[PDB]
Write a protein that binds this ligand. Sequence first.
Ligand SMILES: *[C@@H]1O[C@H](CO)[C@@H](O)[C@H](O)[C@H]1NC(C)=O
Ligand SMILES: *[C@@H]1O[C@H](CO)[C@@H](O)[C@H](O)[C@H]1NC(C)=O
Lengths: 48, 349, 651
Amino acid sequence: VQLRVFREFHLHLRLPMSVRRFEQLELRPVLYNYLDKNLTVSVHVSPV
Amino acid sequence: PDGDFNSYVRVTASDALSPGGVASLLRLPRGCGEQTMIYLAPTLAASRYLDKTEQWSTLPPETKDHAVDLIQKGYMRIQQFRKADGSYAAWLSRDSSTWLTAFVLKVLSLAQEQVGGSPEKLQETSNWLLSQQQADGSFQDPCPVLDRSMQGGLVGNDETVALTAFVTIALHHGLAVFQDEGAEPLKQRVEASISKANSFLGEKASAGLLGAHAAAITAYALSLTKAPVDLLGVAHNNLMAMAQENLYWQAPALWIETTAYALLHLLLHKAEMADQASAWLTRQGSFQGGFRSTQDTVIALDALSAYWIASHTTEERGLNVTLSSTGRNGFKSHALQLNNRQIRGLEEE
Amino acid sequence: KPRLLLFSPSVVHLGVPLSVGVQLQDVPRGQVVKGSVFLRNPSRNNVPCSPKVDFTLSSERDFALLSLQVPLKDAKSCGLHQLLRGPEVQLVAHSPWLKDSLSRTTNIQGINLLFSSRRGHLFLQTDQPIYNPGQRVRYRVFALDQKMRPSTDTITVMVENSHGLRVRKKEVYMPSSIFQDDFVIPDISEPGTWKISARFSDGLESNSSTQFEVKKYVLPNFEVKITPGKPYILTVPGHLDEMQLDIQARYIYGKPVQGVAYVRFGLLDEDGKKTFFRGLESQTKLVNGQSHISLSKAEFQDALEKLNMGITDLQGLRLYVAAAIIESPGGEMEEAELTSWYFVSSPFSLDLSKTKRHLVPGAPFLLQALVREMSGSPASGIPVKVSATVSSPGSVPEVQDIQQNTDGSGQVSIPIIIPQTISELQLSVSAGSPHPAIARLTVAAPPSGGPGFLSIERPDSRPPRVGDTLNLNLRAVGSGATFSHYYYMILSRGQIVFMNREPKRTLTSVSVFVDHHLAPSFYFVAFYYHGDHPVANSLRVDVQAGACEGKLELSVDGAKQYRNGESVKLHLETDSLALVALGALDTALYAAGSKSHKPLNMGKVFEAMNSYDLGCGPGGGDSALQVFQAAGLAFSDGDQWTLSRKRLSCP
Ligand SMILES: *[C@@H]1O[C@H](CO)[C@@H](O)[C@H](O)[C@H]1NC(C)=O
Ligand SMILES: *[C@@H]1O[C@H](CO)[C@@H](O)[C@H](O)[C@H]1NC(C)=O
């Protein structure tokens, strides 16, 4: 039984398998906007 | 220093006679006390050869029961020719013969696995055989067999030594069917008699100048009956010194009989040497209507069955490995074993 | 003249009952026979290691189907496992009537069977198809017997490494016919394919296996699929067709993908050597998630000439196309490859495996063919032309031409007529036009002077479903009408199932109810006695694959769309109390996996059930013994018998 899930507006984040410590990397989360209305959002990463 | 340590061990292990010809020997015994043996001996030899070689799958199951009933009738055939002391002469009125009693004893002993006959009757036959022993362990035949061409290689330069060896062979064959309890003096005297006979055979073999067939049967009798080290060694050395050359020795029945006896003796003792003898024997037996005399049939069939059962047997080919080491985690030793493990060359990690 | 028949499967599986059918032929009405039947080892001694089963026969009841157990304990007792060469056991039917009536040499009649050790079915399942190194693996194994019911026997699972080394072994005592277990892949495991096996403890050769690939991966976001316009390319010297492809990119949740597709072309040989064209590459955007590309004939020929090659060399080579699309503006890239675009000289195919061989003379010969597209679904409406030459029966050979269009699933049944006294038949089949697919078949007629022939006609040439009756028309051709009954039997999954007796009329019709214990195929063997000789014929019927014995419908009523965290109502329904083994799997795993790894569906179950069969070929034989041997029987009446199987697999 195929059972698909959807959000119509979501964040997709794909981290690598592993990263050496002290080595700079770049995160590229992508916003998907499948709604019918042009939007505007603010994106930030929670410090830790 | 703050790394992760892992260890892995992996142990990779890297690894006959045609049924129709032998089947034709099944013939219903008929005739006098000698003709019944004439018919039965190749028949029982053929039954045993097929039975041990597992060639029944090439014949209908009705053949097996027919052979069983035939052998039962043949065994019952000589029960009316038995004398008072189990002499088993050619006739009730005629006198007995040592070779005839030996042959009857051997056949009855070899045919006791299918039908249960009273061993107490076989005790009297063994007793009669013992009663004719001489001072040095030899035996004398009161009357020669009526048919001389069926006796095989017994006739020749020497006859007494071969007759004694054959009688000892028959006694050893009948020794297995002896009851595990009762008649203790009987078995003790049988052991003493056979030991004396092996001593005599070893002395004669050391003396040498014996016939080829006689030397072969004496060597086989010594090897089978647990001869002493010196006598067995000298007999074996005498036998191998007369080996000829895959061709070994339409061949005469004497050649077939001596080759079969040598093959059986050597198998009792198999590396690049029995193969040529077995191949020559099989080629000789491939002749249409081959194995003329009864003795050659019996001995060749027994030798070929023994060779087949010895050659086709396999080996376990097991393996065991144990690792022991000392570390901060106390002490621990670890054992792993591969084997056939239902998979040729099992590999473990 | 009186005879006692004896039928049994060719191969015995130890620990599973044997279906032995006995029959009495040409017996006076006043004779009633009674006896016993048992197995027997010929070598060790006549020690029957099987419970003797009695049978009573008479004129009114001249046949009886007995079930003969072969327990493991007795079979081990007789030394059947101590045999050196040849796993062969004998079956014997002993009755005092034989000696009393026929005055036979001995009252033992039987066959030389060939035992085996397979028994029951085992099915293995894993958590997911492809695993990351250092990730837990959960597997469960179900155990069933040959009757397809749950079993409580004891199995011994074992895992294997990619190199082939054993890694873990266990033994279980199932009370519920399911065994679940977990194990961890070592973190440093190299990429490869691991295998999990499971066999019955007693049965050495009753193993069953599953595979799962181990590979370092990150689960993808979208899947790329390349679809050729046609699954073949015509390299016939007359013309070369167009080469066109459609590449589609689709997110896992359904929405299309916006991005740029970069495609490269090349040649690829069956060995595995790829030769790319330094050129001919395509870089096109994706509209609605699909991009249409094609290779023109002129540019393809130019590329071929630049490679120092001609179009004649494209015999076994295939065009290999690789694509690596880049999503925009996400930036993620995914790759796809095609390795199934063969170069062919004919756009169709022919499968004459359904056609019988050495069929009887005097009755129509049905040629059955399955026209199928080159790497595709079976065709329909494609004309098939058959040229059948009936070779010299005493005069010059005569040819016939018959044309018929395939109906559905490619099946075509062309009834070429054959006269009596035929010598041989030569068949030239051509499917489609232009560029036809040509096949040939030669059939040799049976030797003359036979006691007759039996013709089994099937009015309907379509696979019966389950629960539908099947009608076959028996007829006797070229024989004397001295008998009174036709004797027929059914053989499904290697065991005799049915055995009956139909009276003889003009065009006798037999009806067999296709039950649930006959799937997925069965053999219909019928025969009759023309004096003192058997005349037999056989036939194979493939029951159409459909529903189960029971049922299980997992249905979620509503739309496919959902939202994360939602509650979903899952309904399960059966016909009795059952242990439903559930599992929900992501779909991006299939995209991640390099190679397809199909799950356990009804096809695998059907293959498992019929893998125990002993039948071989589509049926038919030159004599009765050949027919029975092809079917998988062991016949012995007293004058004829079938030689033992040489190996488990048919030639
Ligand atoms: C959203 O953006 C587009 C340009 O990307 C602009 O033309 C449009 O007016 C905006 N609003 C919509 C689509 O409702
Ligand atoms: C069972 O094991 C044998 C080797 O013993 C193997 O060849 C065979 O393919 C296995 N059967 C399966 C996996 O169904």
